[PDB]
Amino acid sequence: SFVEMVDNLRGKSGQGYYVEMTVGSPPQTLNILVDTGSSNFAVGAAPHPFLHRYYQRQLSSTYRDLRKGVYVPYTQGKWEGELGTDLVSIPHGPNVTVRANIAAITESDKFFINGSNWEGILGLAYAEIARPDDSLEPFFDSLVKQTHVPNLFSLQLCGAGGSMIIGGIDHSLYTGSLWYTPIRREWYYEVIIVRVEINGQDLKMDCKEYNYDKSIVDSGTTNLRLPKKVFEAAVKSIKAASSTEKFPDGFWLGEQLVCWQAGTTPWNIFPVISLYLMGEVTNQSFRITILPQQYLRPVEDVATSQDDCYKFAISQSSTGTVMGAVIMEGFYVVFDRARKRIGFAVSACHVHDEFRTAAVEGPFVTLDMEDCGYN
Ligand SMILES: CCCCNC(=O)[C@H](C)C[C@H](O)[C@H](Cc1ccccc1)NC(=O)c1cc(NCCCC)nc(OC)c1
């Protein structure tokens, strides 16, 4: 019975999705960003301009110091602090309490986000990328070891809350079939993209380019991030499709925003993006189709609530493909750790106009999918 965990997430793709958690004895309540792109559980533990509250180790009778420091650098931001353990619970999660590793953040740089309403981060990926090293057991590993919570969780991120189903799959959160792609290696949630189409036209690149470095699923990043060569081809194709309208080159860099009179956004001139993922069966893939309503991120114009403004949510990467929050929105994503696979289905909170639809479709036949992984 997962109904208690439905709608247990708040926040947005721009500043992160967070779940409520309690740490220590007596319980201290904190809002924690859910991050499938990392593996450290860390909380603000000292005053900071953008923190409304923080973990007070001194007030917890169950806190234990590990006398070890830690620092984590991300694509954006970094923090350092002191490692320790304490009792942790998830109010709108499974009814259980675990002793988990906790990094008490004492200094940070461009990590906390003004007005985000979260005070910590829950890294849900594997120990291989945990800092300072892989012997620091991540939270979800601790959860599975100390309780009977099954070794999987699912994320339903919704655009303009959501759900994190801890320990299972809630069939009422999606429609259609779940399609699974193998987790290539247990460090990030690494996957293999075997084909990319824009408005049904193949990008016709060596599929190794799509995974150049790696390809990961990351709820803790906003954008779809693409390696240089793929980003240029994708932007070139998207510009061509919307060429009847003018945008400054800063828009295509995610710097500048674009606006239109409310209700006149020309969605039809922006193409759909189809990402084909390696399937579970020999020579078989499936595809997920991304609408422009996902990669044109709505941004509030505080000057005049007249227009509808958007930011281009596709950016260039030097560390491989990242399927960020705008890609996961509208899909139900199953992180099936027990079976080393990630499932995609159309979400019940799917983004839809009236002419096109986000979709998860298969099967497709794709030869030599193994040659698409970077080495
Ligand atoms: C040590 C090995 C593990 C390192 N693993 C990463 O480094 C991954 C690739 C990355 C994280 O998901 C990071 C988590 C995060 C979340 C909030 C604030 C800072 C960092 N996220 C980003 O670094 C990132 C976040 C955002 N926006 C914040 C809202 C998130 C929905 N924007 C970016 O734009 C480039 C990058």
Swiss-Prot record:
Activity regulation remarks: Inhibited by RTN3 and RTN4.
Keywords noted in UniProt: Acetylation, Aspartyl protease, Cell membrane, Cell projection, Cytoplasmic vesicle, Disulfide bond, Endoplasmic reticulum, Endosome, Glycoprotein, Golgi apparatus, Hydrolase, Isopeptide bond, Lipoprotein, Lysosome, Membrane, Palmitate, Phosphoprotein, Protease, Signal, Transmembrane, Transmembrane helix, Ubl conjugation, Zymogen
Glycosylation sites: 95, 114, 283
Record topology, Extracellular segments: 1-375
Top-level taxon: Eukaryota
Disulphide-bridged cysteine pairs: 158-349, 207-372, 259-309
Subcellular location: Cell membrane; Golgi apparatus, trans-Golgi network; Endoplasmic reticulum; Endosome
PTM section of the record: N-Glycosylated. Addition of a bisecting N-acetylglucosamine by MGAT3 blocks lysosomal targeting, further degradation and is required for maintaining stability under stress conditions. Acetylated in the endoplasmic reticulum at Lys-68, Lys-204, Lys-208, Lys-214, Lys-228, Lys-229 and Lys-236. Acetylation by NAT8 and NAT8B is transient and deacetylation probably occurs in the Golgi. Acetylation regulates the maturation, the transport to the plasma membrane, the stability and the expression of the protein.
Quaternary structure (record): Monomer. Interacts with RTN1; RTN2; RTN3 and RTN4; the interaction leads to inhibition of amyloid precursor protein processing. Interacts with SNX6. Interacts with PCSK9. Interacts with NAT8 and NAT8B. Interacts with BIN1. Interacts (via extracellular domain) with ADAM10 (via extracellular domain). Interacts with SORL1; this interaction may affect binding with APP and hence reduce APP cleavage. Interacts with NRDC AND NRG1.
Comment field on protein domains: DXXLL motif is required for a proper endocytosis and retrograde transport to the trans-Golgi network, as well as for regulation of lysosomal degradation.
Listed name of the protein: Beta-secretase 1
Organism: Homo sapiens
Protein's gene: BACE1
Full-protein residues shown: 59 to 446 of 501
